[PDB]
Coordinates of C-alpha atoms and ligand atoms in Angstrom, one line a residue:
Chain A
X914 CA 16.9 3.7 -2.1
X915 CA 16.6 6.0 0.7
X916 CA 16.2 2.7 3.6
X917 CA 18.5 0.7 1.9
X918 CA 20.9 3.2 2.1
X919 CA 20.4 3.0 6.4
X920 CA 20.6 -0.4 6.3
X921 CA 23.8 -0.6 5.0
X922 CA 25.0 1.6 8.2
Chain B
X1430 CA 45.6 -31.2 -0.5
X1431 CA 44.3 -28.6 2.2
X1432 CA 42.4 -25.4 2.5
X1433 CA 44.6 -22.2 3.3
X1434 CA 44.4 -19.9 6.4
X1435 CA 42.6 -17.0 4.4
X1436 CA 40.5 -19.5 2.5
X1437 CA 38.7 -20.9 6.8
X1438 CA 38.8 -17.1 7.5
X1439 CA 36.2 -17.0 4.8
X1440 CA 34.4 -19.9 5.9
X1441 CA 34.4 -18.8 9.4
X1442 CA 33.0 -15.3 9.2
X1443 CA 30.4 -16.7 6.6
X1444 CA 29.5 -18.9 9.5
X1445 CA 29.3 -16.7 11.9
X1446 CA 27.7 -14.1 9.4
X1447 CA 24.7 -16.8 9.1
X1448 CA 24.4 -17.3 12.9
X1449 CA 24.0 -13.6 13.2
X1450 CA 21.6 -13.0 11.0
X1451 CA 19.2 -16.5 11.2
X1452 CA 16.9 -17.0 14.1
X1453 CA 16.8 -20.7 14.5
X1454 CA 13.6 -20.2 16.9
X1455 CA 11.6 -18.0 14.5
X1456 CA 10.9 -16.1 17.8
X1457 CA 10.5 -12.9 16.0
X1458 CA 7.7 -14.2 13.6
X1459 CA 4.6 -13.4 16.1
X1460 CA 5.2 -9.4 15.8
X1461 CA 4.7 -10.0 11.5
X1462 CA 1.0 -9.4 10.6
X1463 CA -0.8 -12.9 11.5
X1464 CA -1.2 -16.0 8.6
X1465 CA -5.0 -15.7 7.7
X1466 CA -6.1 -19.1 5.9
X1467 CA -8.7 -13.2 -1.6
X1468 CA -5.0 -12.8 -0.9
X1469 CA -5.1 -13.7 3.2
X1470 CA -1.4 -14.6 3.1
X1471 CA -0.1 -11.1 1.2
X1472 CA 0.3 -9.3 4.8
X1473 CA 1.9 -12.4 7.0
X1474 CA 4.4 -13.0 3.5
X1475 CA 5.5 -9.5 2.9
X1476 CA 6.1 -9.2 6.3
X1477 CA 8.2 -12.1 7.1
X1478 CA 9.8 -11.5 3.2
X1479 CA 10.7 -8.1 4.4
X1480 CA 12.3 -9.4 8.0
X1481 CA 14.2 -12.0 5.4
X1482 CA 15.6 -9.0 3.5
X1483 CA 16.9 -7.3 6.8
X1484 CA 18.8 -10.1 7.4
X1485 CA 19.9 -11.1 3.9
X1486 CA 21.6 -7.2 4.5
X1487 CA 22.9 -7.7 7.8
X1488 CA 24.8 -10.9 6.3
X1489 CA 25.7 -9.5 3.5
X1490 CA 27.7 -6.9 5.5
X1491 CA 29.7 -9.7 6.8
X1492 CA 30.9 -11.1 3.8
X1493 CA 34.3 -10.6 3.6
X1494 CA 35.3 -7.5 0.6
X1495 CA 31.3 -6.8 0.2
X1496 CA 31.3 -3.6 2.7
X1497 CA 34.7 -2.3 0.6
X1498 CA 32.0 -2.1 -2.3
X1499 CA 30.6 1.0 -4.2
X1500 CA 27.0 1.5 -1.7
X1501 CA 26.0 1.7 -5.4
X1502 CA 27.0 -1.2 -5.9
X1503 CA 25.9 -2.9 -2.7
X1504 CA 22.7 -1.8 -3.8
X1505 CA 22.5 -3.7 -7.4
X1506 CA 23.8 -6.8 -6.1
X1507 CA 21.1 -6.5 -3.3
X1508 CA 18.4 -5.7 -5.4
X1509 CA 18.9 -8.5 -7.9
X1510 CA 19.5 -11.0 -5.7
X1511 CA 17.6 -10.6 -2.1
X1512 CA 14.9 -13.4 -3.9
X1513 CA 17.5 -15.5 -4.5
X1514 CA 19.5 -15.3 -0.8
X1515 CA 15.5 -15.8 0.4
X1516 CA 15.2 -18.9 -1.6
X1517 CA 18.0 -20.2 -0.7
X1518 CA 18.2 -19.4 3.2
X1519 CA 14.4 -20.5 3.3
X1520 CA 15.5 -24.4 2.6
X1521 CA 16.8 -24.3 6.3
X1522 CA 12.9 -24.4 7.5
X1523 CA 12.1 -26.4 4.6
X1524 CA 11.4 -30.3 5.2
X1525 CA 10.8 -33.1 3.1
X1526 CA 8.6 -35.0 5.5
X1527 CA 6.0 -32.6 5.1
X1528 CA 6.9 -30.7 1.9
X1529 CA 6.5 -27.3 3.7
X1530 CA 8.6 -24.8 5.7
X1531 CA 8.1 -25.5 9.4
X1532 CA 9.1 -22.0 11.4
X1533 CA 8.1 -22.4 15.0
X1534 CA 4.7 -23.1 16.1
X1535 CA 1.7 -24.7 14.6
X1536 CA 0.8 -21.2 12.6
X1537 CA 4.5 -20.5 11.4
X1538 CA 3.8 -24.1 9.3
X1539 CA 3.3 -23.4 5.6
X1540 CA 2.2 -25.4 3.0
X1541 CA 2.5 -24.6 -0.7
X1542 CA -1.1 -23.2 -0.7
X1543 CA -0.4 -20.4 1.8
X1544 CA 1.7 -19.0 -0.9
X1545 CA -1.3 -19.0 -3.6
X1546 CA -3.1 -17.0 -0.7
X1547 CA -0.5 -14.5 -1.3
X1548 CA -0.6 -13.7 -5.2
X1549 CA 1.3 -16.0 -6.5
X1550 CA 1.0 -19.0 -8.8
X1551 CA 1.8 -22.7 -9.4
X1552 CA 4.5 -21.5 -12.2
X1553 CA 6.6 -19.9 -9.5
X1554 CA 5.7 -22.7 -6.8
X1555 CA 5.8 -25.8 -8.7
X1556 CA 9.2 -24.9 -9.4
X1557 CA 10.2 -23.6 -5.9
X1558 CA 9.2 -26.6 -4.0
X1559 CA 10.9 -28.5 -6.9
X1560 CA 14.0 -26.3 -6.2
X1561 CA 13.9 -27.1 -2.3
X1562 CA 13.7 -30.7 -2.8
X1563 CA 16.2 -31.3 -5.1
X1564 CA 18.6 -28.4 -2.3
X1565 CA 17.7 -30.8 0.5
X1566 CA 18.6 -33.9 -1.0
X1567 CA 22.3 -32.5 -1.3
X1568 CA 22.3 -32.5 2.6
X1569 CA 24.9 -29.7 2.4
X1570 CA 27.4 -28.9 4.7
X1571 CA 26.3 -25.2 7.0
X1572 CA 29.7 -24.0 5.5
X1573 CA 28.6 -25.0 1.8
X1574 CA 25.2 -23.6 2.7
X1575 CA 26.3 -20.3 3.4
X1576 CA 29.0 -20.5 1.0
X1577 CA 26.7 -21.0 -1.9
X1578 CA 24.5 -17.8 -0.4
X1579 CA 27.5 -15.7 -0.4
X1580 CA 28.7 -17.1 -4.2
X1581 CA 24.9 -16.0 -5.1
X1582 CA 25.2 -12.6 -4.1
X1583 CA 28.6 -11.9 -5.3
X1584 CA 27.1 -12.6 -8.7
X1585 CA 29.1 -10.0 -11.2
X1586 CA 26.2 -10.4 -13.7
X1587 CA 23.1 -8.4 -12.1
X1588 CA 21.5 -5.4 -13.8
X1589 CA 22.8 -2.3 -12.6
X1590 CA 26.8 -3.5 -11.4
X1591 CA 29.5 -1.3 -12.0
X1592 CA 32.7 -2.4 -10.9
X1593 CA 32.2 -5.9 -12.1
X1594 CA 35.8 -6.9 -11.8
X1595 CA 36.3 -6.6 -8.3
X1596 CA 32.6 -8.3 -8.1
X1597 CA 33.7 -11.3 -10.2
X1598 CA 37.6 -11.3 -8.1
X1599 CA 35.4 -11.7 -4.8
X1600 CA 32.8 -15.0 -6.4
X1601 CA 35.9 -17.0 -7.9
X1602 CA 37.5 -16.0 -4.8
X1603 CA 34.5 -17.8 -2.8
X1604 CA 34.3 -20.5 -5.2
X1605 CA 37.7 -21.8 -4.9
X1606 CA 37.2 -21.5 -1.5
X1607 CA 33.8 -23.8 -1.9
X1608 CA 35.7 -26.5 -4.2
X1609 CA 38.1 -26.8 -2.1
X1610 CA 35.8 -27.4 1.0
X1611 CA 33.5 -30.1 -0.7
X1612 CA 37.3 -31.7 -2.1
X1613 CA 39.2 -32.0 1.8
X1614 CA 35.7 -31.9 4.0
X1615 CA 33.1 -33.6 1.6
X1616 CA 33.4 -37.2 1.6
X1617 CA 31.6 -38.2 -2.0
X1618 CA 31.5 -34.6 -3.0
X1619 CA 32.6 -35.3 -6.4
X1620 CA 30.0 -33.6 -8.3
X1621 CA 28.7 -31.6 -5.9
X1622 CA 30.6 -28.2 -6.7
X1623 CA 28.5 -28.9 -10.3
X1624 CA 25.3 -29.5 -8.6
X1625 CA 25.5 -26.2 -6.6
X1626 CA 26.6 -24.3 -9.5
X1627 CA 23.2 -25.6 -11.5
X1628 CA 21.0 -24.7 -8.6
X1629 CA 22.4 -20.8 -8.6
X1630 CA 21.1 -21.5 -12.5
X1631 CA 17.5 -22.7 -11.0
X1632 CA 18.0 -19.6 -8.8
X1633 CA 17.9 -17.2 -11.4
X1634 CA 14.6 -18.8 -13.6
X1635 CA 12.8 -18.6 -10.3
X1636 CA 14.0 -14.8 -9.8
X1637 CA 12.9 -14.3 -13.0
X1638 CA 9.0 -15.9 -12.2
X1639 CA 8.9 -14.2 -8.8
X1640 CA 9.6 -11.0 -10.9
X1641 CA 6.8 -11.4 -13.7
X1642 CA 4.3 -12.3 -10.6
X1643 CA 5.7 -9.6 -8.2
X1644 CA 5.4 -6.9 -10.8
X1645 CA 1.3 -8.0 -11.5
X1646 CA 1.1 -7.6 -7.8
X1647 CA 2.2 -4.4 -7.1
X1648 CA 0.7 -2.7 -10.2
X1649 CA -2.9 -3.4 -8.1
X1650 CA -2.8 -0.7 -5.7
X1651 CA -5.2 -2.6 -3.3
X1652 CA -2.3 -5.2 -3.3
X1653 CA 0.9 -3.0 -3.2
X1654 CA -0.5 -1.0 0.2
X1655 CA -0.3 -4.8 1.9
X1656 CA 3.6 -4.5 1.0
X1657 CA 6.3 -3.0 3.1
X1658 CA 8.3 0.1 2.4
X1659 CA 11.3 -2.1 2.0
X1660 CA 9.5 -4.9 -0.1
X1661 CA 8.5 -1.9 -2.5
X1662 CA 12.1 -0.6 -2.5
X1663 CA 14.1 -3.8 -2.9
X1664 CA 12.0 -5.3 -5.3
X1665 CA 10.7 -2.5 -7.1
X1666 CA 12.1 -0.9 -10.2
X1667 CA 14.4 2.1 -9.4
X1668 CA 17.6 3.4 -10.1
Chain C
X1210 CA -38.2 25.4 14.6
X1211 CA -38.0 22.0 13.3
X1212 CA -35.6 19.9 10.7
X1213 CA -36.4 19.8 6.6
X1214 CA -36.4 16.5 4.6
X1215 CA -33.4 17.1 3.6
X1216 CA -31.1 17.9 6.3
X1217 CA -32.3 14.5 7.5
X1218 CA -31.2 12.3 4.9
X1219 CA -27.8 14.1 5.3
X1220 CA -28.6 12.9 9.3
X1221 CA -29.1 9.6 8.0
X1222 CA -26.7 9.2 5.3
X1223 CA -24.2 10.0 7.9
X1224 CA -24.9 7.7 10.5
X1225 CA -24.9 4.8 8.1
X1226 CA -21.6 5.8 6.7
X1227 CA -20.2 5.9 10.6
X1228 CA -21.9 2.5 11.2
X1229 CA -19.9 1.0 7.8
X1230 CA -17.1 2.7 8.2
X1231 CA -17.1 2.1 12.7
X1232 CA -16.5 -1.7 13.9
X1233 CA -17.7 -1.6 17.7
X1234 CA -16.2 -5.1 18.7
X1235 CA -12.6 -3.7 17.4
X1236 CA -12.4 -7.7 16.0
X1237 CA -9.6 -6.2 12.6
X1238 CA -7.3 -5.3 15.6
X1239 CA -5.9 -9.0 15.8
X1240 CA -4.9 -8.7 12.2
X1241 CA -2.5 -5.4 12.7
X1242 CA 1.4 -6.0 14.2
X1243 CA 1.1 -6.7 17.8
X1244 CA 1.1 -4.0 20.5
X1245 CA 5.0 -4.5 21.8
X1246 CA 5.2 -2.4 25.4
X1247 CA 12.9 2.1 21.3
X1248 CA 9.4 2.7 19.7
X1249 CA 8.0 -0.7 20.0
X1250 CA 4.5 0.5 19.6
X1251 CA 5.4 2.1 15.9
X1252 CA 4.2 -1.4 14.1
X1253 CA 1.0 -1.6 15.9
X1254 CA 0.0 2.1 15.5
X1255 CA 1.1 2.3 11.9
X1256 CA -0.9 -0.8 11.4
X1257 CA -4.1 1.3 13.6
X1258 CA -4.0 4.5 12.0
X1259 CA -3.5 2.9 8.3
X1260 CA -6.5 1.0 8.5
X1261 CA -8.2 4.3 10.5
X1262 CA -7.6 5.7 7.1
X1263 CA -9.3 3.2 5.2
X1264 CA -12.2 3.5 7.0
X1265 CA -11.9 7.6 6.6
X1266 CA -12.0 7.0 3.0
X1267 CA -15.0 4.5 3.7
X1268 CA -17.1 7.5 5.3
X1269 CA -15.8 10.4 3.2
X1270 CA -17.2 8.7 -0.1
X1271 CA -20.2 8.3 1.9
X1272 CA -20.7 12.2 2.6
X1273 CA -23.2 13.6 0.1
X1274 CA -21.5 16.0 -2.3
X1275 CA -18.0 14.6 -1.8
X1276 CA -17.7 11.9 -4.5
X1277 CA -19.0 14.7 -7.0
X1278 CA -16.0 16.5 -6.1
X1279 CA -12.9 16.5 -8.5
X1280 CA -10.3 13.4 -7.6
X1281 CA -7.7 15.6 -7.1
X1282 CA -9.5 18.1 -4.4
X1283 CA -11.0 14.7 -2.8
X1284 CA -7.5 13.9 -2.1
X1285 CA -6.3 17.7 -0.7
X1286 CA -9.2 17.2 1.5
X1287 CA -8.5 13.3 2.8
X1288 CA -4.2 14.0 2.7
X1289 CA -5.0 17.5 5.2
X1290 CA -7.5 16.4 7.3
X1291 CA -7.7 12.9 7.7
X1292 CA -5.3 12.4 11.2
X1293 CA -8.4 15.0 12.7
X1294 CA -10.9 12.7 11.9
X1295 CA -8.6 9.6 13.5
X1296 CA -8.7 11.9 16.7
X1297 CA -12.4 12.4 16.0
X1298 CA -13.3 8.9 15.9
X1299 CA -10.8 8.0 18.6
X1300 CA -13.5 9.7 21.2
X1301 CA -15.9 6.6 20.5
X1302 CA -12.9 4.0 22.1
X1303 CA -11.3 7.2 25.0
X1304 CA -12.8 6.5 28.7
X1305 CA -12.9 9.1 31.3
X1306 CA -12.5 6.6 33.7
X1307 CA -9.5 5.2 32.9
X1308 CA -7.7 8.1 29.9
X1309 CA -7.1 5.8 27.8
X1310 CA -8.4 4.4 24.5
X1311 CA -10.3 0.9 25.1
X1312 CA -10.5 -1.1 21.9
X1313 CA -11.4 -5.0 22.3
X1314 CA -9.1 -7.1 25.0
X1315 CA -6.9 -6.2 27.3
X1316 CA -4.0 -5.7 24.4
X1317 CA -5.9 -3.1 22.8
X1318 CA -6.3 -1.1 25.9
X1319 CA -4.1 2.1 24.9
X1320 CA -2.3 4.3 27.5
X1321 CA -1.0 7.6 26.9
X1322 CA 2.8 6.3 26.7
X1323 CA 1.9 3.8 24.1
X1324 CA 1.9 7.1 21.3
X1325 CA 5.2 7.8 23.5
X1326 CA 6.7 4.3 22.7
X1327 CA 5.4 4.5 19.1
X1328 CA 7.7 7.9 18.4
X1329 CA 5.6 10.8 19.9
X1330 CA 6.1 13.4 22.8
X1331 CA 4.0 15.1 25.7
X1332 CA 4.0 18.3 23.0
X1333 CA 1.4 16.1 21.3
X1334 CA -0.1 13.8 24.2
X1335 CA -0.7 16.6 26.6
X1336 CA -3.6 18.3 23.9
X1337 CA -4.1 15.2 22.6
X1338 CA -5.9 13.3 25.9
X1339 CA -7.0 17.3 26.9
X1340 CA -8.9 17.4 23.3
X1341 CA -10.1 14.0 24.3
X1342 CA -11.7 14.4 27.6
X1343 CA -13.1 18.3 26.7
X1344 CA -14.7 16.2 23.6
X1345 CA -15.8 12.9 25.8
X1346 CA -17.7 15.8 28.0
X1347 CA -20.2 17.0 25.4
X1348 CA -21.7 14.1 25.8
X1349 CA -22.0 14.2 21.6
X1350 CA -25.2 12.5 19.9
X1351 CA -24.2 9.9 17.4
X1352 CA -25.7 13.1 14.8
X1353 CA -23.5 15.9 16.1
X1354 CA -20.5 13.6 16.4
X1355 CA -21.0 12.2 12.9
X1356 CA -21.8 16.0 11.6
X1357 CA -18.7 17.2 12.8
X1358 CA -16.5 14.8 11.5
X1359 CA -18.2 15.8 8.0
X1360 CA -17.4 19.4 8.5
X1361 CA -14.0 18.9 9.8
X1362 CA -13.3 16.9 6.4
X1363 CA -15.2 19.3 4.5
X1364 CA -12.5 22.4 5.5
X1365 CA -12.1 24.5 2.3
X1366 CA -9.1 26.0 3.8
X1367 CA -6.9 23.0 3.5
X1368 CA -3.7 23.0 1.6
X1369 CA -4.3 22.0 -2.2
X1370 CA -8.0 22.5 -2.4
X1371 CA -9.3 23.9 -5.8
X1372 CA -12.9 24.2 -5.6
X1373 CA -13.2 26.0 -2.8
X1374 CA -16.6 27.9 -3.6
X1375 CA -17.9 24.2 -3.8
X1376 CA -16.5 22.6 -0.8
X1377 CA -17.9 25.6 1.5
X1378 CA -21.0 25.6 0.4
X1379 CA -21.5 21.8 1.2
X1380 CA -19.7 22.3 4.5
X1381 CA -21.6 25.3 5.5
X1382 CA -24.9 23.2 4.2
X1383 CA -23.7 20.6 7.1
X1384 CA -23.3 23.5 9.5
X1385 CA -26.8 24.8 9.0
X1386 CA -27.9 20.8 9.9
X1387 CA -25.3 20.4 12.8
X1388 CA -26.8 23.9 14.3
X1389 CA -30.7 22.8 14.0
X1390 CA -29.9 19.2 15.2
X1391 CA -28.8 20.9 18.5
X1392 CA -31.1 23.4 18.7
X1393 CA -34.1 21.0 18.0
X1394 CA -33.1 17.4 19.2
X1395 CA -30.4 18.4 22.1
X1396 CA -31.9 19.9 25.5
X1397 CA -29.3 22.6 26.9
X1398 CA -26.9 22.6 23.3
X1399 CA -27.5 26.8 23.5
X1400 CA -23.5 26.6 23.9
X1401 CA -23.1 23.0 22.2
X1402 CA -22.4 24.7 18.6
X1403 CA -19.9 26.9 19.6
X1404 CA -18.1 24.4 21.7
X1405 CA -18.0 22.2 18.7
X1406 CA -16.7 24.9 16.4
X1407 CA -14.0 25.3 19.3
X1408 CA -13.2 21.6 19.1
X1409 CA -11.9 22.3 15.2
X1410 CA -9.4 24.9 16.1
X1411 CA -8.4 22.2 18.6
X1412 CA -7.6 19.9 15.8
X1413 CA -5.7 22.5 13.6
X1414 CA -3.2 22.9 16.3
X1415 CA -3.0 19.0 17.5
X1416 CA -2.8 18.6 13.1
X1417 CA 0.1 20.7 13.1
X1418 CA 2.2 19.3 16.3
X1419 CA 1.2 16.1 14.8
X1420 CA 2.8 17.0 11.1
X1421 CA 6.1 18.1 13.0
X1422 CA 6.6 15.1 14.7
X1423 CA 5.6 12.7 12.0
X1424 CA 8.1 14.9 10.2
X1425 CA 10.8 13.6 12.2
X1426 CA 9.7 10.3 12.2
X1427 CA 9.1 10.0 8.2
X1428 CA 13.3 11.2 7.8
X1429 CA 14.5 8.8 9.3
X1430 CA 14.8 5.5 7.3
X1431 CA 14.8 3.2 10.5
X1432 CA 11.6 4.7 11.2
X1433 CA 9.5 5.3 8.3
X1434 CA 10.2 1.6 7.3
X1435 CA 7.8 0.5 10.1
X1436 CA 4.9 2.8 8.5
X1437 CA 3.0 1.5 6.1
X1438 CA 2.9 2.9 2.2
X1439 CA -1.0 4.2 2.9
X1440 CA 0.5 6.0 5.8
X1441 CA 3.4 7.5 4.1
X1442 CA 1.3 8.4 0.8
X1443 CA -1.4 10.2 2.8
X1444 CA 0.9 11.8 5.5
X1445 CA 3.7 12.0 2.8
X1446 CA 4.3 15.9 1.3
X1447 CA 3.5 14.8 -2.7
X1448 CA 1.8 16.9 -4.6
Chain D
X1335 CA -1.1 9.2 -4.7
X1336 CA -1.9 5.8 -6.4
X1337 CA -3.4 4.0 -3.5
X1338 CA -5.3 7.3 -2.3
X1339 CA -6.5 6.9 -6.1
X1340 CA -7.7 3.4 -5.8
X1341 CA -9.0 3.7 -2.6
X1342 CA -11.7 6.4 -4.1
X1343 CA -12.8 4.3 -7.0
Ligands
LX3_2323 C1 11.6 -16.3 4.2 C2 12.1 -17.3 4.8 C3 11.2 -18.5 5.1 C4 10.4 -19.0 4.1 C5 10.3 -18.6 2.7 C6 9.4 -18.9 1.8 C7 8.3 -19.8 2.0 C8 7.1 -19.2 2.7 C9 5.9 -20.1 2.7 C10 4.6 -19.5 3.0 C11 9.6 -18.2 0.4 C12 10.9 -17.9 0.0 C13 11.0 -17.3 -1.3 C14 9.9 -17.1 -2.1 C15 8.7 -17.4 -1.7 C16 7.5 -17.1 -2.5 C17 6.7 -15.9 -2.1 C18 7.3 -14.6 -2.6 C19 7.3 -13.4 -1.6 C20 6.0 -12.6 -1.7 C21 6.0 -11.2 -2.3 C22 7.2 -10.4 -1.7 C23 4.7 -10.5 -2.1 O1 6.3 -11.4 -3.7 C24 8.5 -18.0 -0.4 C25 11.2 -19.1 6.5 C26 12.6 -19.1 7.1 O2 13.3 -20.1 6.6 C27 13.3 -17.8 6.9 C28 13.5 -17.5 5.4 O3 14.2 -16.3 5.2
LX3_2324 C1 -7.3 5.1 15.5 C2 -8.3 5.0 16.3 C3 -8.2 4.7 17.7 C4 -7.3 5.3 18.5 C5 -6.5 6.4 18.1 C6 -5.4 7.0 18.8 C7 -4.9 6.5 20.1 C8 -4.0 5.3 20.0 C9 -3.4 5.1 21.4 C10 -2.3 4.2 21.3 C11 -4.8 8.2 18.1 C12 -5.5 9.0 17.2 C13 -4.9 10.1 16.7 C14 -3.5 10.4 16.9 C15 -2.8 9.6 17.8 C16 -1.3 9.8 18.0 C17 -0.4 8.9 17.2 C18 -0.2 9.3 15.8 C19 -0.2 8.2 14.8 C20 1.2 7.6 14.6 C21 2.0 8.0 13.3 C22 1.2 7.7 12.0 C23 3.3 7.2 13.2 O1 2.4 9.4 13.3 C24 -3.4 8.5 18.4 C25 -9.0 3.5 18.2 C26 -10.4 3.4 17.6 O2 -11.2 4.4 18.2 C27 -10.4 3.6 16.1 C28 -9.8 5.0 15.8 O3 -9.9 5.2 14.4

């Protein structure tokens, strides 16, 4: 869930 | 009987939280891949499906307890119910004049058929336009709108949550919240609270249908390479 | 000295895989994320070079001896050299005149700080356009263009290729036709082979600063988000 | 390589 991960900051 | 302080803090950065994260001039929709009218839609859809779930993130990061979460956590509840906060969100562009989301311009209009040009079926839409009519008629209230969005997300029962607990303290914690609003602020809300409740159960039957047709999809490799990197992630199936 | 049957059906087998695999009018361009001018031009040109690779795929399968190959050396091939045979093809849209790439309208006219705003550096632009206008000045026939781009994608010394006896002798087969082309059908080539052979080593470097900085790109989430799953799969590091 | 796959045949 590597982008999900950046999303959530 | 009146809501609390803490209770229009809620209500207030929910508000806020929605006006942050939804563009009521769909400005952004002309950098998507273009609406062409075998599967003509799929680019334009996952496109503007994987701006939705960018924004369904930003807000949830504003509802108030979520960011205190397990990034684990943050993660199932995402997962399980982006569809859902899409659904539901989506009924702002939807109109009963015309039966079709209205986003902008004359290209951003789309009719039930665009989303047949885009792999899905009349099982998932018959259903989803039957959703958004029966949403619209309950003219809610912005604050009940978002309120119901943040209720839907803080769902303790999604595959993959951990600390449930805290998940189901934060929901009831919204909910009373909600009652309370529709009680002292809807006039004639007497069985609204109800008919909100039953559409996060409509929410969940169309989850379920997206799933079955999403899954067909991206199995077809030809298909799943029209998809985003975060369409793939969010809706796909790992751990 | 004159050409055998053979070596010109692989003339003509080529050029009809180019023609497929080439649109001239650049009409698909409409269809990609538009060209937006903090790496603003990433949609567009992960959009370009994704459907570049399509169309690499297109003329590979087209090269005689290449769909005999085994899947899996297919792919070593297509995963290592493909982003040469974009810069390749690329040629057929540069202008001298103006340095740039001209494909279609004025949107698709592409300046050297486009690749800048899309998440690349002067490391890579500075060969890049210098490959570019040392290839746009040997004047290639459609043939010897078309060749080369065969025997650029038919390398045996990539990364991950198994049937390397194989692959060499169909490459150096395409040699022997690239080499006769010139020295039959190209007034004044005596130094056109050579020059051409040059041009590959070219492309090994401008492969590798390309790798390095698409490196950078791919790691960070923010980024590789705005590629598309073609792109990440072929300039991905799977095995 | 599933699309890579596809893409071949
Ligand atoms: C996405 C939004 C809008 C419309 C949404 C819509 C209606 C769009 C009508 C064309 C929609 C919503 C949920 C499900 C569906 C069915 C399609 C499922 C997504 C495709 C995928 C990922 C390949 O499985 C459509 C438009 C605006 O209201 C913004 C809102 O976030
Ligand atoms: C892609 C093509 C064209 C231009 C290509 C070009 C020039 C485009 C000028 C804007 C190009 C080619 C190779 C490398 C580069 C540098 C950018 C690297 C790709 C980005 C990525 C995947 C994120 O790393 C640009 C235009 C037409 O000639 C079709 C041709 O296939």
């Amino acid at each position: 869930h590597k982008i999900l991960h950046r999303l959530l900051q | 009987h009146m809501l609390s302080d803490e209770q229009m803090q809620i209500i207030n950065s929910l508000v806020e939280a929605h006006h942050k994260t939804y563009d009521d001039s769909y400005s952004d929709f002309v950098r998507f891949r273009p609406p062409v009218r075998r599967l003509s839609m799929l680019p334009h859809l996952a496109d503007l499906v994987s701006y939705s779930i960018q924004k369904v993130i930003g807000f949830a990061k504003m509802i108030p307890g979520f960011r205190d979460l397990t990034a684990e956590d943050q993660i199932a509840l995402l997962k399980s119910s982006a569809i859902e906060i899409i659904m539901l969100r989506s009924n702002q562009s939807f109109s009963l004049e015309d039966m079709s989301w209205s986003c902008g311009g004359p290209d951003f209009k789309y009719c039930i058929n665009d989303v047949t040009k885009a792999g899905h079926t009349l099982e998932l839409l018959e259903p989803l336009v039957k959703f958004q009519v029966g949403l619209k008629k309950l003219k809610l209230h912005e604050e009940e709108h978002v309120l119901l969005m943040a209720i839907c997300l803080l769902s303790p029962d999604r595959p993959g949550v951990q600390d449930h607990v805290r998940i189901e303290a934060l929901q009831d914690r919204l909910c009373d919240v909600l009652q309370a609003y529709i009680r002292i602020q809807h006039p004639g809300g007497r069985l609204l609270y109800a008919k909100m409740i039953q559409k996060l159960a409509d929410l969940r039957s169309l989850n379920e249908e997206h799933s079955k047709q999403y899954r067909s999809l991206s199995f077809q490799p030809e298909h799943s390479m029209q998809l985003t990197p975060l369409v793939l992630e969010v809706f796909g199936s790992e751990v």
